[PDB]
Amino acid sequence: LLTFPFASTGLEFPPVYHELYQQRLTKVRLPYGDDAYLAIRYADVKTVLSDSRFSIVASLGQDQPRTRAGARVGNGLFSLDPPQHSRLRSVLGRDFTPRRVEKLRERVRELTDQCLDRMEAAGSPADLVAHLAVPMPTAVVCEMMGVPEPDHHLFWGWAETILSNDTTPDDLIRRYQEFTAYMGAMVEERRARPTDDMFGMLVRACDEEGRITEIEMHALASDLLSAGFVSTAHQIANFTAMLLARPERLQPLVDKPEQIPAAVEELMRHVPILSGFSFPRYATEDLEMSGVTVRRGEAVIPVIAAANRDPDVYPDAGRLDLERNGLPHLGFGQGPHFCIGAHLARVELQVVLEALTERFPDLRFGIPENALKWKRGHFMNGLHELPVAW
Amino acid sequence: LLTFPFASTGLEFPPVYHELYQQRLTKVRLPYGDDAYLAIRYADVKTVLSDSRFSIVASLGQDQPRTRAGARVGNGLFSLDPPQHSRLRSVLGRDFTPRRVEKLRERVRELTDQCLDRMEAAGSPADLVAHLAVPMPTAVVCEMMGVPEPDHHLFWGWAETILSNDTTPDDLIRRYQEFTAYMGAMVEERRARPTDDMFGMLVRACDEEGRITEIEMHALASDLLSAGFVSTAHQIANFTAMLLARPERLQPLVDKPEQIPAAVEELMRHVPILSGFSFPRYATEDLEMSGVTVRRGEAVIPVIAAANRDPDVYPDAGRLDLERNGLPHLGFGQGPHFCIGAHLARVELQVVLEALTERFPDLRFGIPENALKWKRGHFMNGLHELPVAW
Numbered sequence: 001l002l003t004f005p006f007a008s009t010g011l012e013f014p015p016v017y018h019e020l021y022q023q024r025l026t027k028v029r030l031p032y033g034d035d036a037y038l039a040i041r042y043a044d045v046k047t048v049l050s051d052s053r054f055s056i057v058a059s060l061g062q063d064q065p066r067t068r069a070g071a072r073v074g075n076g077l078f079s080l081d082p083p084q085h086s087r088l089r090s091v092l093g094r095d096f097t098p099r100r101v102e103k104l105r106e107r108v109r110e111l112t113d114q115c116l117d118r119m120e121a122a123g124s125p126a127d128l129v130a131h132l133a134v135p136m137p138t139a140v141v142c143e144m145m146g147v148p149e150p151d152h153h154l155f156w157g158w159a160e161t162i163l164s165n166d167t168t169p170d171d172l173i174r175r176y177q178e179f180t181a182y183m184g185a186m187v188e189e190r191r192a193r194p195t196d197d198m199f200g201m202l203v204r205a206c207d208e209e210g211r212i213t214e215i216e217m218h219a220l221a222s223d224l225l226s227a228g229f230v231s232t233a234h235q236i237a238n239f240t241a242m243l244l245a246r247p248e249r250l251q252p253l254v255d256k257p258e259q260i261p262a263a264v265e266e267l268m269r270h271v272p273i274l275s276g277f278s279f280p281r282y283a284t285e286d287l288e289m290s291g292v293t294v295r296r297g298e299a300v301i302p303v304i305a306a307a308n309r310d311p312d313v314y315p316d317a318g319r320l321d322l323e324r325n326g327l328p329h330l331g332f333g334q335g336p337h338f339c340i341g342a343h344l345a346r347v348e349l350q351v352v353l354e355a356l357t358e359r360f361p362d363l364r365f366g367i368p369e370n371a372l373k374w375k376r377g378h379f380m381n382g383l384h385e386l387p388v389a390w
Numbered sequence: 391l392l393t394f395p396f397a398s399t400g401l402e403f404p405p406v407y408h409e410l411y412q413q414r415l416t417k418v419r420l421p422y423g424d425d426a427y428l429a430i431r432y433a434d435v436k437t438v439l440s441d442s443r444f445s446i447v448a449s450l451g452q453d454q455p456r457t458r459a460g461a462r463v464g465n466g467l468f469s470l471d472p473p474q475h476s477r478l479r480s481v482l483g484r485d486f487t488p489r490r491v492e493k494l495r496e497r498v499r500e501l502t503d504q505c506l507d508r509m510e511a512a513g514s515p516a517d518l519v520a521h522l523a524v525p526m527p528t529a530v531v532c533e534m535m536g537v538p539e540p541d542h543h544l545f546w547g548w549a550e551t552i553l554s555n556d557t558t559p560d561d562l563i564r565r566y567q568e569f570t571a572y573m574g575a576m577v578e579e580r581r582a583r584p585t586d587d588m589f590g591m592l593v594r595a596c597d598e599e600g601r602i603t604e605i606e607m608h609a610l611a612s613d614l615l616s617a618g619f620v621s622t623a624h625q626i627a628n629f630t631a632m633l634l635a636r637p638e639r640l641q642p643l644v645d646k647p648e649q650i651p652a653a654v655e656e657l658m659r660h661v662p663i664l665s666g667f668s669f670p671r672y673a674t675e676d677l678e679m680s681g682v683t684v685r686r687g688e689a690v691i692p693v694i695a696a697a698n699r700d701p702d703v704y705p706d707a708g709r710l711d712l713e714r715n716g717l718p719h720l721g722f723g724q725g726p727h728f729c730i731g732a733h734l735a736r737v738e739l740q741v742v743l744e745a746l747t748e749r750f751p752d753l754r755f756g757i758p759e760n761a762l763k764w765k766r767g768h769f770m771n772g773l774h775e776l777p778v779a780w
């Protein structure tokens with residue numbers, strides 16, 4: 001069988017996908033776990049993500065297809081199907097609706113401004129990863145949750161552990177133990193002095209209203225503080241690097257600031273954020289997909305980066321066209337597990353581009369593009385550093 | 391209770407939504423059937439359409455909230471929840487993927503050109519509704535299914551019965567009898583001799599593969615010949631009118647054809663196609679929506695038109711901006727029942743704007759704007775006629 005993931009470096013999209021688009025659904029071998037099919041057509045990835053005949057739960061003795069040594073297991077949102085998944089997420093739902101997140105726009109800009117004050121002070125050329133991509137989205141969720149600045153580094157360490165392909169089940173226990181200890185102390189603080197932040201809301205959801213158990217309270221906290229900043233950090237960097245590699249760099253968005261939202265969406269579509277893949281889903285019954293009968297219990301991987309370059313949905317898919325305004329990309333997923341933070345990410349990315357265009361309109365690479373240190377072996381594509389000059 | 395639908399005329403967005411968006415989920419009373427909540431925020435209409443806790447089936451004795459006198463009931467796709475819905479739909483799925491539908495672009499343009507030849511031959515001013523909006527999408531699906539041209543008028547009549555608010559269960563009996571008779575004949579004919587058309591595919595699905603039963607084959611065919619062209623017909627005229635009512639008319643799209651797909655999407659967002667509403671959904675368990683506890687069994691109506699002008703999703707929502715390339719609209723719906731024809735409709739609307747810009751760049755209203763005969767009190771908004779000049 002073909003082995004997956006395929007060879008690529010940086011944000012490269014590998015040419016093998018252009019072969020597979022026109023073939024039937026193909027089975028691949030993965031680094032750990034059972035084999036799986038590769039959903040790469042737009043409609044197929046949509047199906048895998050959103051159709052009730054695909055379960056995110058391995059209930060028929062499957063060995064989870066994956067790139068990480070330890071199978072991804074827990075009691076939080078990625079471990080549940082609807083309706084259980086739906087009631088649990090609805091504990092967070094109302095804090096991530098556009099109507100709520102839109103109110104954060106100002107604070108996001110403020111934090112972004114502080115970061116850039118600090119970058120400007122450091123002087124050209126500076127590492128935009130260290131000065132902006134890491135700090136800003138981390139502050140955003142940590143102050144949303146109620147985690148003090150000085151502990152941010154702990155949550156980076158736990159999130160890298162989740163995301164590292166070389167993490168073992170032991171490594172995950174160690175994480176679980178450390179994280180539980182941390183939040184447990186935070187729970188006790190909030191019980192004695194209640195706070196208005198999200199963790200406070202979670203503690204009340206548990207203690208007062210009896211809406212969730214302690215296990216669910218911790219699980220949701222773990223999900224947000226794990227999923228909630230490392231992805232945006234990687235994208236802040238990926239997005240700027242994509243833009244600076246263009247002859248005109250930021251100038252189109254300097255000239256036409258009203259096109260920044262569209263630009264954010266095109267980049268969401270075009271950047272292959274993952275060198276791995278997310279959760280496989282499993283057929284709850286036999287079903288047909290791209291010329292193949294997928295049997296009950298068999299795993300299908302949703303390759304969202306291939307979806308976002310489907311030749312039939314997106315003409316000239318490999319071209320970054322910031323005016324494309326393409327059909328709706330799958331970069332935040334689809335169906336039940338559609339990114340609960342999708343609007344917050346869009347706000348964070350719109351705000352980063354606003355602030356860079358307004359403050360550093362002549363922003364450019366601070367080293368030769370050829371010297372950029374892309375992450376090589378990692379679950380997520382991105383940059384170790386992004387030196388920029390102004 | 392607040393009565394719904396709200397007063398509006400033509401494609402006017404009624405101002406009352408600007409009130410309701412700020413407020414908690416509100417309950418309305420309908421022309422027929424039980425009362426229901428009005429889902430109007432983006433995220434809420436999404437939930438209603440996509441969340442498994444919302445069923446399209448009244449399984450607890452409910453009287454379907456509606457504007458039509460006779461309740462909407464049958465054996466096709468709008469009468470099913472997943473997975474039963476999913477299994478029936480999958481019989482058609484393959485034929486409506488973008489990969490399949492993109493192959494129809496040539497033929498859709500051919501038919502659009504024939505329509506425009508007749509219009510031009512009729513002479514300025516001419517009615518674009520009669521010459522293009524009605525014939526072209528009717529011909530597209532009927533020839534897809536294998537229905538001959540001379541019989542198109544019959545399918546228009548059956549479709550309007552379904553869509554007319556003044557239709558009784560008796561009128562629906564007549565329709566069903568007439569329609570079943572007609573497709574029965576088509577079935578005999580396809581059984582006596584194979585044809586490579588969509589109805590012929592349904593016949594193979596019933597007779598040869600035993601995938602579906604005879605009344606499901608009929609249902610599916612009825613769904614497609616009912617939903618499959620009156621909507622596109624109404625939008626072709628709605629879209630053209632929207633464009634012709636602006637100072638610049640068609641010139642922005644003449645000048646930049648590459649923006650035609652984006653305009654189609656903005657129009658889909660902006661145009662309130664329904665005066666009424668689609669199917670209500672029923673909560674299958676207690677849940678929270680916009681500050682209200684929706685109890686099990688209670689109905690919630692997804693108001694697509696309102697979601698598409700959600701003030702927090704869409705800044706300045708009332709403005710038709712063809713470059714907006716906004717966050718994805720709910721105009722083709724969402725979840726299980728997301729329009730099976732969405733790509734075909736995008737193809738049809740794109741091709742119509744391509745053909746109109748290329749052939750009639752100085753297209754303009756053929757009568758004074760205030761004379762336009764907008765449909766009054768009908769289920770869908772639109773024009774009885776659209777005189778155009780060139």
Ligand code: HEM
Nearest residue numbers: 077078227228231232235278279332333337339340341345
């Ligand atoms: C550019 C940044 C981001 C990207 C590209 C992204 C992408 C995604 C994708 C594709 C999924 C679904 C994976 C699957 O279905 O297998 C997901 C889920 C999730 N994301 Fe995001 N995300 C981003 C930012 C955020 C933010 C800012 C937050 C929270 C503050 C967040 C929290 C979550 C959570 C909790 C889930 C699981 C939701 C569920 O299973 O119900 N993400 N994200």
Ligand code: HEM
Nearest residue numbers: 467617618621622625668669721722723727729730731735
């Ligand atoms: C501008 C044109 C169109 C618009 C605005 C439109 C809109 C919609 C919407 C919003 C729904 C879902 C309603 C709900 O969930 O309550 C739907 C369903 C449906 N549409 Fe379309 N549609 C269009 C064109 C078409 C075309 C061209 C076809 C051709 C086959 C078609 C066939 C269907 C069918 C069969 C369903 C039911 C699907 C299901 O329940 O699984 N429609 N449409």
Ligand SMILES: CC[C@H]1[C@H]2[C@H](C[C@H]1C)[C@H]1C[C@H]3/C=C/C(O)=C4/C(=O)N[C@@H](CCCNC(=O)/C=C\C[C@@H]3[C@H]1[C@@H]1O[C@@H]12)C4=O
Nearest residue numbers: 071072073074075076078162222223226227228231273278
């Ligand atoms: C750029 C977007 C990427 C996403 C990525 C998929 C990509 C599209 C998911 C993959 C999740 C793995 C999760 C995971 O391995 C586990 C696990 O081992 N146990 C549980 C409970 C442990 C605590 N919760 C979590 O850590 C929950 C989410 C963290 C990540 C999350 C990242 O945001 C980035 C679980 O969810």
Ligand SMILES: CC[C@H]1[C@H]2[C@H](C[C@H]1C)[C@H]1C[C@H]3/C=C/C(O)=C4/C(=O)N[C@@H](CCCNC(=O)/C=C\C[C@@H]3[C@H]1[C@@H]1O[C@@H]12)C4=O
Nearest residue numbers: 461462463464465466468552612613616617618621663668
């Ligand atoms: C602008 C788009 C509009 C859509 C509209 C909702 C809007 C968003 C739906 C509403 C459906 C009503 C359906 C309906 O009344 C019935 C009924 O009475 N019996 C069944 C079986 C009868 C045979 N199937 C059908 O007629 C199936 C679809 C036709 C319409 C369909 C039109 O595309 C237009 C049924 O579905």
